[PDB]
Write a protein that binds this ligand. Structure first.
Ligand SMILES: [Fe+3]
Ligand SMILES: [Mg+2]
Ligand SMILES: [Mg+2]
Ligand SMILES: [Mg+2]
Lengths: 191, 211
């Protein structure tokens, strides 16, 4: 038997706050960071830059941390970054089978589905079927590689740039790089 | 710890509750949901009461049925509360008084953890390694599907971190080690019963040995 979760969560807050252990505006500040600053729009920016700037692409793939630092997007759960490059014969997908490990600052906090037991159990073993069920068909002539986020590396996928986007601006490209593209379960689509 | 949290490879689950690019709603679906992470950071960064590794472990320590029936953010409310009680900062009495009802916590640890190993090997990209065939009852960042399996190094980190099996129990002997991206063939991990290509696990040096 358990008290409502809202009551338990606020009880934890109140117990700590009432002992002076929580600075003024502390949880409010974190809420703002989580809701407004940590965003897949940042990862999209990185991808769009890599797509249009061969030099930056090279930096992003060889020293992800330095590349992300240039944009000022290192942060909690995103201090050591590795970007993994999709190719015509390789599709990368990220999971945290043991919990929910995610590059928060550049992908945003993980969505419910990514933290689900279903995704955590299945994508490591049957990524092709999982992606297919989610709406992404990966042909058999393509290697699927699943990165399980088990330590401190925090990953982003650099997806392939779709045909039909030649000449687009970085802002235009950013729009088609979604959260799901950064996690690796979706391929960018030309609207 | 060979707990129910070690889910990779478990069979019988249904569909992932998402189709690509579907609306996931707001970051927080209830007004309390930012609390577990924020209070984790209060504990780690402001109070120095515990490490992030200790938070992963205390969640692993939820009674197994409790773990399996509890939504994500709730597990971290339970985990952070448990640590606060274990560290002598809060009492369960006061949590239940403020909550107005039962606030069951994670189970006590059954292991004191283990130190970072003194004997490890620096590996290089392209080298073949085996995951040490070891069983650790406390916290460990090795999912069971790779125990005793052989793969190839694709990255050695340029930074080092405390050994989770030590710092996840608040021990003083976690040292520091780099981790390695170890690439396994899907068939090395799941035989014929997989549709994948490769799986890359980010493994602490102390979990590895020359193949
Ligand atoms: Fe995780
Ligand atoms: Mg082109
Ligand atoms: Mg134009
Ligand atoms: Mg197991």
């Amino acid at each position: 038997a358990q008290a409502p979760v809202s009551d338990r969560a606020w009880a934890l807050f109140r117990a700590l706050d009432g002992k002076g252990l929580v600075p003024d505006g502390y949880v409010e500040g974190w809420k703002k960071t989580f809701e407004e600053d940590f965003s897949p729009r940042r990862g999209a920016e990185l991808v769009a830059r890599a797509w249009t700037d061969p030099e930056f692409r090279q930096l992003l793939l060889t020293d992800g941390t330095a590349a992300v630092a240039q944009y000022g997007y290192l942060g909690p759960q995103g201090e050591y970054i590795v970007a993994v490059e999709d190719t015509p014969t390789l599709k990368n997908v990220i999971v945290c089978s043991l919990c929910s490990c995610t590059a928060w600052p550049i992908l945003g906090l993980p969505p419910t589905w990514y933290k689900s037991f279903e995704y955590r159990a299945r994508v490591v073993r049957e990524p092709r079927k999982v992606l297919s069920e989610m709406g992404t068909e990966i042909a058999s002539d393509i290697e699927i590689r699943v990165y399980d986020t088990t330590a401190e590396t925090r990953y982003m996928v650099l997806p392939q740039r779709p045909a039909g986007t030649e000449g687009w601006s970085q802002e235009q490209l950013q729009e088609i790089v979604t959260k799901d593209c950064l996690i690796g379960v979706a391929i960018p689509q030309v609207p | 710890m060979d707990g129910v949290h070690d889910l990779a490879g478990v069979q019988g689950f249904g569909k992932v509750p998402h189709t690509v690019n579907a609306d996931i709603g707001p970051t927080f679906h209830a007004e309390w949901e930012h609390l577990p992470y924020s209070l984790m950071f209060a504990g780690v960064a402001e109070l120095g009461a515990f490490s992030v590794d200790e938070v992963r472990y205390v969640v692993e320590r939820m009674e197994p049925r409790h773990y399996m029936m509890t939504p994500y953010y709730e597990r971290y409310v339970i985990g952070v509360a448990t640590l606060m009680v274990e560290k002598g900062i809060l009492t369960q009495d006061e949590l239940e008084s403020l909550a107005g009802g039962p606030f069951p916590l994670s189970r006590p640890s059954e292991s004191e953890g283990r130190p970072a190993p003194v004997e490890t090997t620096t590996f290089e990209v392209g080298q073949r390694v085996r995951v040490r065939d070891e069983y650790v009852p406390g916290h460990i960042r090795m999912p069971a599907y790779c125990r005793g399996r052989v793969g190839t190094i694709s990255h050695r980190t340029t930074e080092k971190w405390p050994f989770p099996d030590a710092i996840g129990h608040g021990r003083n002997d976690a040292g520091e080690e780099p981790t390695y991206h170890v690439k396994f063939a899907a068939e090395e991990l799941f035989g014929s019963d997989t549709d994948g290509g490769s799986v890359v696990v980010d493994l602490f040096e102390g979990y590895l040995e020359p193949a």
